[PDB]
Amino acid sequence: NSFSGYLKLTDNVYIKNADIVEEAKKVKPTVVVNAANVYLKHGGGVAGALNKATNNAMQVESDDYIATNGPLKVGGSCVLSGHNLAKHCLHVVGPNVNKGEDIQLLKSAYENFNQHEVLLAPLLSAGIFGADPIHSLRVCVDTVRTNVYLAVFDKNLYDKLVSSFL
Numbered sequence: 001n002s003f004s005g006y007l008k009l010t011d012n013v014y015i016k017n018a019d020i021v022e023e024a025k026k027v028k029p030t031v032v033v034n035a036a037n038v039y040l041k042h043g044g045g046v047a048g049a050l051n052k053a054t055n056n057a058m059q060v061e062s063d064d065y066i067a068t069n070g071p072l073k074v075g076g077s078c079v080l081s082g083h084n085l086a087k088h089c090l091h092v093v094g095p096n097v098n099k100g101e102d103i104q105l106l107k108s109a110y111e112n113f114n115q116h117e118v119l120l121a122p123l124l125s126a127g128i129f130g131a132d133p134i135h136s137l138r139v140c141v142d143t144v145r146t147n148v149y150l151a152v153f154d155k156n157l158y159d160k161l162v163s164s165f166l
């Protein structure tokens, strides 16, 4: 958990303009959060980037988890291996609002973070899930009480987030 170059937004939320994969390789955190879907199919976005950095080990483990346990619920999570990136990966499903899933579930999704003292995480429900990323940071700030280090891989978005937060 040797995080460097973060900006502290609140007592427990830090942010950096960085690729979460690169942060995980440098820091080897106890927990890295994946922005997952309910079948843990890591096709693109943050999920595809984390799985590629494990050379598909995350996807083979995820497929075995789903065959044995079934899919997650939207707003839910599971803990699996972090492989080479972290001790553990917390796979968290935020709502895909472009598919009609309720934006209320984004609070439930961020509540999963409170089971871990320190986390390296992305913005949930941003990207293909369709939520406004600044709204996602507001729900993170209002919901997460443990120590969260957010990596946002887009300098334009990072500057909008920092400016909106102050």
Ligand SMILES: CC(C)[C@H](Nc1ncnc2[nH]ccc12)c1cnn(C)c1
Binding pocket: 018, 019, 020, 021, 035, 045, 046, 049, 122, 123, 124, 125, 126, 127, 128, 129, 133, 151, 152, 153, 154, 157
């Ligand atoms: C908003 C965007 C910058 C963010 N992407 C990322 N954020 C952080 N590390 C990353 N590595 C590769 C992509 C990536 C995103 C995409 N989908 N979701 C749910 C979040």
